[PDB]
Design an enzyme around this catalytic site. Structure first.
Site, short mmCIF file in Angstrom:
data_model
loop_
_atom_site.label_atom_id
_atom_site.label_comp_id
_atom_site.label_asym_id
_atom_site.label_seq_id
_atom_site.Cartn_x
_atom_site.Cartn_y
_atom_site.Cartn_z
N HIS D 53 56.99 36.22 65.98
CA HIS D 53 56.20 37.45 65.91
C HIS D 53 57.05 38.58 66.48
CE1 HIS D 53 53.18 34.25 66.41
NE2 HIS D 53 52.41 34.98 65.60
N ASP D 56 57.10 38.56 70.21
CA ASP D 56 57.78 37.45 70.88
C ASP D 56 59.23 37.83 71.16
OD1 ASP D 56 55.50 35.70 70.45
OD2 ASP D 56 56.42 35.02 68.55
N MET D 87 61.71 32.99 58.52
CA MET D 87 60.38 33.55 58.45
C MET D 87 60.14 34.38 59.71
SD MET D 87 57.11 33.19 59.90
CE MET D 87 56.64 31.52 60.34
N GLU D 180 48.14 33.09 55.90
CA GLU D 180 47.77 31.89 56.62
C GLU D 180 46.26 31.87 56.87
OE1 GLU D 180 50.05 30.89 60.05
OE2 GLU D 180 48.46 29.54 60.79
N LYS D 182 42.68 30.33 58.40
CA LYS D 182 42.14 29.59 59.53
C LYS D 182 40.63 29.82 59.53
CE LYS D 182 42.78 28.81 64.52
NZ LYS D 182 43.32 29.37 65.78
N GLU D 216 48.36 25.72 57.58
CA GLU D 216 48.66 25.00 58.82
C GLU D 216 47.80 23.74 58.89
OE1 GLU D 216 49.07 27.11 62.69
OE2 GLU D 216 47.76 25.58 63.50
N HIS D 219 44.61 23.90 60.93
CA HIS D 219 43.62 24.89 60.52
C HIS D 219 42.68 24.33 59.44
CE1 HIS D 219 46.16 28.34 62.37
NE2 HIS D 219 45.73 27.47 63.27
N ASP D 244 53.02 25.38 58.04
CA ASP D 244 53.02 25.11 59.47
C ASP D 244 52.58 23.67 59.71
OD1 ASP D 244 53.71 27.77 60.06
OD2 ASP D 244 51.73 28.26 60.89
N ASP D 254 41.47 24.78 68.17
CA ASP D 254 42.80 24.64 67.58
C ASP D 254 43.76 24.04 68.63
OD1 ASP D 254 44.98 25.19 65.69
OD2 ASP D 254 45.17 27.20 66.54
N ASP D 256 46.91 22.47 68.12
CA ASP D 256 48.35 22.66 67.92
C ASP D 256 49.18 21.54 68.58
OD1 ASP D 256 47.90 24.99 66.39
OD2 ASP D 256 48.43 26.34 68.01
N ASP D 286 54.29 24.94 64.03
CA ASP D 286 53.51 25.86 64.85
C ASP D 286 52.70 24.96 65.77
OD1 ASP D 286 52.09 27.78 66.10
OD2 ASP D 286 51.19 28.65 64.29
MN LIG Z 1 50.17 29.10 62.26
MN LIG Z 2 46.88 26.45 65.12
#
Ligand SMILES: [Mn+2]
Ligand SMILES: [Mn+2]
Ligand SMILES: [Ca+2]
Ligand SMILES: [Ca+2]
Ligand SMILES: [Ca+2]
Ligand SMILES: [Ca+2]
Ligand SMILES: [Ca+2]
Ligand SMILES: [Ca+2]
Ligand SMILES: [Ca+2]
Ligand SMILES: [Ca+2]
Ligand SMILES: [Ca+2]
Ligand SMILES: [Ca+2]
Ligand SMILES: [Ca+2]
Ligand SMILES: [Ca+2]
Ligand SMILES: [Cl-]
Ligand SMILES: [Cl-]
Ligand SMILES: [Cl-]
Ligand SMILES: [Cl-]
Ligand SMILES: [Cl-]
Ligand SMILES: [Cl-]
Ligand SMILES: [Cl-]
Ligand SMILES: [Cl-]
Ligand SMILES: [Cl-]
Ligand SMILES: [Cl-]
Ligand SMILES: [Cl-]
Ligand SMILES: [Cl-]
Ligand SMILES: [Cl-]
Ligand SMILES: [Cl-]
Ligand SMILES: [Cl-]
Ligand SMILES: [Cl-]
Ligand SMILES: [Cl-]
Ligand SMILES: [Cl-]
Ligand SMILES: [Cl-]
Ligand SMILES: [Cl-]
Ligand SMILES: [Cl-]
Ligand SMILES: [Cl-]
Ligand SMILES: [Cl-]
Ligand SMILES: [Cl-]
Ligand SMILES: [Cl-]
Ligand SMILES: [Cl-]
Ligand SMILES: [Cl-]
Ligand SMILES: [Cl-]
Ligand SMILES: [Cl-]
Ligand SMILES: [Cl-]
Ligand SMILES: [Cl-]
Ligand SMILES: [Cl-]
Ligand SMILES: [Cl-]
Ligand SMILES: [Cl-]
Ligand SMILES: [Cl-]
Ligand SMILES: [Cl-]
Ligand SMILES: [Cl-]
Ligand SMILES: [Cl-]
Ligand SMILES: [Cl-]
Ligand SMILES: [Cl-]
Ligand SMILES: [Cl-]
Ligand SMILES: [Cl-]
Ligand SMILES: [Cl-]
Ligand SMILES: [Cl-]
Ligand SMILES: [Cl-]
Ligand SMILES: [Cl-]
Ligand SMILES: [Cl-]
Ligand SMILES: [Cl-]
Ligand SMILES: [Mn+2]
Ligand SMILES: [Mn+2]
Ligand SMILES: [Mn+2]
Ligand SMILES: [Mn+2]
Ligand SMILES: [Mn+2]
Ligand SMILES: [Mn+2]
Lengths: 387, 387, 387, 387
Positions: D53, D56, D87, D180, D182, D216, D219, D244, D254, D256, D286
């Site tokens: 991002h 980041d 990406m 993306e 979710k 993802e 998700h 992802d 979520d 992850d 991710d």
């Molecule tokens: Mn993601």
């Molecule tokens: Mn996630």
């Protein structure tokens, strides 16, 4: 106009209206509130009282002098407003030291620290007049299978609750414990994930009479369970010591919506049950004003918690008092459900040919339960649509 | 090559391999099986035994003469094969008379009939050598809030289980009961929806020692719960009297996939726990060969249940025996989790400055749990990828 | 008193009120209904019309003579009552031949049969005046990963829908198709599991204008999705050709409760949206009177579907018309949401320092959305609690 | 020994291994990582590249001079290691200004700011060599029904994506967008909640060829959907532009988890599909190393992502190459599924009496699909248990 007063026993956690709006992907949207301002604003809305985690009232790491000043100011606000503190609890989840639990941390030194932190705050809770001490073990559990031997963890959880029971008995305190289940979040799976698991666990404690549950609407709903049913089982066991009210839209992250939001019919049946059963404890809200809101929206959301409880109370009472509903309840044999199956005893049942040999199963099967008519009367009452 | 033998104690319900494939939207895809053929074919696959609902073995409404012939043929098949019957149960859900429940039907005459039907089959279960009598109250519950007062229903459920306990005591039978939770389906919500709720309920029965749970993999998973965690709590309580093994892909309708399908890592951690704990009961499968299958696929699916158990048993044993895993378990402080928090006692804990005043919370917080390395060793063992 | 009339366009499937009550664990609790009696009883309740699967109206395997008599009697009942048939569909799920699908069965001969069966009933649907032909591919999908190559299955599904489009074009029919998503049940996972997946799929068909969606309340809710949001996306795409109304309590088996039951606030927001958008199609109920009910309860449940729609319509209209709500909608910037972000165009946006270089992000962040006040006004309207 | 190399195209977000461990109830457990150290440590583990991002890589509110220094240091680390940046994406969710969305914020000034912030980072992404620009609209949606008119919001979302398409076209950039989905979290419901909804939305954009999905694992699994099925539909549409990879244990917050954790059989079928289809994009993770872990556990968790992909790749390849599996696939008619239903055309199908008039539905119905044998061969391959 559904105006709350302190006699309604509505309470709020400091952490609820004081939630700054940090969620799993975003920074705070609101400034921190001084507990004194929360007490004053909640009193103005008709609240009965407030609750706290240790660390909501006294910043973590406070000196003794700081601690006394924080408590002094808070007690002045309670005295100024007539607000009560019926319940307090420990924060055993925020500080990184609790990343694998408090009472069931794999690290023994962390478990001991968790107990000391809890005991310190029990003393303060008693000082401030709390009748109930909640424990939500949000960090007790695991993301992976090898990380947590659950039998060992339940041994440690029992040891911790037994020691707390020993402590309150040793001090002559009247306070009782209320264990709060949650199925997951922040751990992948949390130990004592539902009302049932917490009730079962309490029966293995040394002094089970000192412990009940603190069920939260949204938590049971995160397992797709029926919250009114779980509350009925807690009442049946004599263990509904406290309750957290809020809203949740299904199985997903813990939303903590204001009470009445989420599953509104479940909120109706909950209020119907609490009022029918004569639950006498606090109507406590553990909710988060959404982070979309500014402070005006915080107080609107809080007010809405209480308003929705009072609307649902009116509609449930009207439902139960309606002679047409009473007739429908008889039509659906709710009266028969409340009569013993076999007060005549086992031998009489075995000897009763009407119970088997001469039971007309087809005639019984053909009798409709009339549950849809009953439920549409309930819907009509909820919506103010009788006619 | 993961070949089962009777010593593995694998059992199957008649209703499992005999499922004709009627689902919520479709007609049967397979002919009915004669119980005698199921016994023979399961024995050929290495099964230890079979279980039954009353109505699986004796068609509902059978004359006494028909009943004796059905039982005689079944007992000849057991004798021919060496198959055992470790468990039996009652069908209190198929017949339309049970549309609002058996033991908690609103209609009192139906509750009495449910008990008589159950008692008749307990006698037969004992005759055939069963040690465990399961009760799955699939019709106990509600679709709407007014239909079922849950406190009254739990009064009736307790009355029913108490009467069954009185009955087996009166006959000198050694058989024990295992209550099977399920959260929903066929009722919108089922009473005693999880292992926790069933464990809690048992503690209010007059003779709690006569009752345990019969947890089913898929049922706890229908509430999004961790099945190994629930089994650990049942073991902790000394109440794992029987178990149903199968697979489930998440929160949805009850799939009853063959064991190992669904959540395969949960199946691994379950087998690890059952074997570590020395569970000595039947490894019973309550599964449905999917209705896509013909009878060859029925027996393939059944064989796969047992095969998957044996593969997972091997991998879990290898995991626990691996010195590198034992080192990782120490690194993650699983040893510390199994040591008492405060065997020194409450006063010693209160006086221990290392537990609070001089506890370095930041140093403790900085210590990683090393759970990811441990879990990847578990993954490597499961997949046969060590290296 | 919320009395429906035919002008309200309420419709019901024959299979709804005619559901005999077979569920995943129990036998029928009600006799089969003659379609003629269902037409008459629904007309008496104020219904506009009825819908059918081929096999609801003409028993599977009927001779041509039987078929003509079944249709003749049905058409006489429609003429006698003024009831319409706005929609029909094919049963491609009950018969064991469809155990792996109709249009995406692995067996090519079954796919061809599915198309022929569908085409035969399209002709009849047109004869009876239907404007919409629904396809719910309940058997399209899998319980296991190797059983169904989903790219190949979508190739076959596209081929089938393309052929049906070719067929209706070749006959000059005005009828359009509505594809009904469902995430699972009876298959472990169903293809085109949500409104989104069905909308996306339609865009790859040769004549996309001939196809829309037939979303069902409960189906999107079985994936935990927001049904009003999905309906808004279908409306946004111009693809809401038909809708199925019912209730569902969360993520679990497909309950098909009467409309208004289940998620009542979602029902409110759905009606608000359908009415605001001017949806002009049938308000069709795909529901099951619970198997607890006798035929009096069937008609009570059906009546309740329509009653709840009309109550929610009144409350949503009152909400939108309330000047205090209109002020709250402005306070929450719903007006701004309906204004273009950059009608000035890309270059103007890039050159607009107020959009970045001189944008006061903190001032914007501090502006509360006032969503809680707005939502409590919505709650007050729903419950008839304004004041 | 399943060792990754850059040729495997494994990539990681800076925010993944750099996650400090703040969750919905707790403070950070790890220090922030310098992006330069993450690049170096990931390269050492065999990663191909990293993603970011905007915020980041460049702290929010950085001066131009600070921005250039942050980018310069990062580019030196990429050059030092040979790591790529395939990406990048925009953070439109952390800052309180995005509390009601970026592109679909009710406040128009926020929508304009969101676009400017995105455009600035597209330029940087192109500079650093990214082929794909992801958009996860985590704040687009609502907690309550009145807060968000979804048709208006989709108008704004389309406007925003159209403007971004206009922008990249105007600059001659080769970069493409990946939206993306979710279903929820951090909003109560998120717009474009699934792969299907995002695919459908793309078809209404002005230049649909510039947009695909970035699905993802976790998700789609948060909606209880089958991730491999959704990936197959994305591939079928030619829209799998990026992916992802991670793990998720069912319908809940979520998680992850590292890839391979969560639903391990779904991970197997995903890898089987990506490899069979020849997906050529990054295998991007991710994920969040759990907050229980220290930095050694961060790198262990990251390594495990890649290891699990490579194990599953081996097992899926072995499955597909096994002549016994190829025979089972024919036995289950997967070959027939890949053949056109009616290449002979509509008229030929209508004239084919073998498709209806003379189709033996009972013989077809009796043919078992043999899916259980096929799936147990798949299980045996996954577990390394062939024999
Ligand atoms: Mn993601
Ligand atoms: Mn996630
Ligand atoms: Ca304000
Ligand atoms: Ca009584
Ligand atoms: Ca009597
Ligand atoms: Ca065969
Ligand atoms: Ca020990
Ligand atoms: Ca020590
Ligand atoms: Ca009647
Ligand atoms: Ca406009
Ligand atoms: Ca302006
Ligand atoms: Ca370390
Ligand atoms: Ca082909
Ligand atoms: Ca042919
Ligand atoms: Cl109250
Ligand atoms: Cl913050
Ligand atoms: Cl701030
Ligand atoms: Cl402020
Ligand atoms: Cl020590
Ligand atoms: Cl327990
Ligand atoms: Cl007690
Ligand atoms: Cl109580
Ligand atoms: Cl809500
Ligand atoms: Cl409800
Ligand atoms: Cl606000
Ligand atoms: Cl704010
Ligand atoms: Cl075994
Ligand atoms: Cl059948
Ligand atoms: Cl058959
Ligand atoms: Cl046969
Ligand atoms: Cl009597
Ligand atoms: Cl209980
Ligand atoms: Cl006991
Ligand atoms: Cl045990
Ligand atoms: Cl599976
Ligand atoms: Cl697991
Ligand atoms: Cl088969
Ligand atoms: Cl079959
Ligand atoms: Cl209408
Ligand atoms: Cl039947
Ligand atoms: Cl009947
Ligand atoms: Cl009848
Ligand atoms: Cl051919
Ligand atoms: Cl598509
Ligand atoms: Cl179109
Ligand atoms: Cl439309
Ligand atoms: Cl309901
Ligand atoms: Cl809602
Ligand atoms: Cl009825
Ligand atoms: Cl009935
Ligand atoms: Cl790869
Ligand atoms: Cl922090
Ligand atoms: Cl730190
Ligand atoms: Cl550090
Ligand atoms: Cl302007
Ligand atoms: Cl769309
Ligand atoms: Cl395109
Ligand atoms: Cl693609
Ligand atoms: Cl896992
Ligand atoms: Cl799978
Ligand atoms: Cl670690
Ligand atoms: Cl850490
Ligand atoms: Mn909560
Ligand atoms: Mn709580
Ligand atoms: Mn089951
Ligand atoms: Mn079972
Ligand atoms: Mn349905
Ligand atoms: Mn439908």
């Amino acid at each position: 106009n559904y105006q709350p007063t302190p006699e309604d026993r509505f309470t709020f956690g400091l952490w609820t209206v004081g939630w700054q709006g940090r969620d799993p992907f975003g920074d705070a949207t609101r400034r921190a509130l001084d507990p004194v301002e929360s007490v004053r604003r909640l009193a103005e809305l008709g609240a009965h009282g407030v609750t706290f985690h240790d660390d909501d009232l006294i910043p973590f790491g406070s000196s003794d002098s700081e601690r006394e000043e924080h408590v002094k100011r808070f007690r002045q606000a309670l005295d100024d407003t007539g607000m009560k503190v019926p319940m307090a609890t420990t924060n055993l989840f925020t500080h990184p030291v609790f990343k694998d639990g408090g009472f069931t941390a794999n690290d023994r030194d962390v478990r001991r620290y968790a107990l000391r932190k809890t005991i310190r705050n029990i003393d303060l809770a008693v000082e401030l007049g709390a009748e109930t001490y909640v424990a939500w073990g949000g960090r007790e559990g695991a993301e992976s299978g090898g990380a947590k031997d659950v039998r060992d963890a339940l041994d440690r959880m029992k040891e911790a609750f037994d020691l707390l029971g020993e402590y309150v008995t040793s001090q002559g305190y009247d306070i009782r414990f209320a264990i709060e289940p949650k199925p997951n979040e922040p751990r992948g799976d949390i130990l004592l994930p539902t009302v049932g698991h917490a009730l079962a666990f309490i029966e293995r404690l040394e002094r089970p009479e000192l412990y009940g549950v603190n069920p939260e609407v949204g938590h049971e709903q995160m397992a797709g369970l029926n919250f009114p049913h779980g509350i009925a089982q807690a009442l049946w066991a004599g263990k509904l010591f406290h309750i957290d009210l809020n809203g949740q839209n299904g199985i997903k992250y813990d939303q903590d919506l204001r009470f009445g939001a989420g599953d509104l019919r479940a909120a109706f049946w909950l209020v119907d049950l609490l009022e029918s059963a004569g639950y006498s404890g606090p109507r406590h809200f553990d909710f988060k004003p959404p982070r979309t809101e500014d402070f005006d929206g915080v107080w609107a959301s809080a007010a809405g918690c209480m308003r929705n409880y009072l609307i649902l109370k009116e509609r449930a009472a009207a439902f139960r008092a309606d002679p047409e509903v009473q007739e429908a309840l008889r039509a659906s044999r709710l009266d028969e459900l409340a009569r013993p199956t076999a007060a005549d005893g086992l031998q009489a049942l075995l000897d009763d040919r009407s119970a088997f040999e001469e039971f007309d199963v087809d005639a019984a099967a053909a009798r409709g339960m009339a549950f849809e008519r009953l439920d549409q009367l309930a819907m009509d009452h909820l919506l103010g649509a009788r006619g």
